[PDB]
Structures are given as structure tokens and as C-alpha cells.
Amino acid sequence: ELSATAQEIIKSQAIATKKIISDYHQQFRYKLQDFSDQLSDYYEKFIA
């Protein structure tokens, strides 16, 4: 019983552990895209 309980607990933990990283990586990339877009208009905003 103890072995089964431990196995199911670790299985439950693993999915959420992966889920967090999966959520965060895409936003990590979108931030790079946003920053690259921002750099384009720096000179124009400055001059204007």
C-alpha cells in the first residue's frame, strides 16, 4: 500500500512540475519578440 501511494504521489507531482515550465517558456519567447519590436521605433520616438 505504501509503495502504491508513493508512486501515485510522484506521478501526480510530475505533471504539474512539467506544466509550470511549459507555461513559462512561451511567455519567455513572447517577451523577446516584444522587446525586438520595441527597438524598431526608438529613434523615431526620440526624434519626434
The DSSP secondary structure of 9-47, one letter per residue, reads HHHHHHHHHHHHHHHHHHHHHHHHHHHHHHHHTHHHHHH
Distance CA 44, CA 17 (A): 44
- Residue 28's CB is within 10 A of a number of other CB atoms, namely 9
Radius of gyration of the chain from its Cα atoms, rounded to whole angstroms:
22
Q: How was this structure determined?
A: cryo-EM
Distance CA 31, CA 24 (A): 11
The residue with cell 512561451 is: 26
Distance CA 20, CA 45 (A): 37
Distance CA 20, CA 46 (A): 39
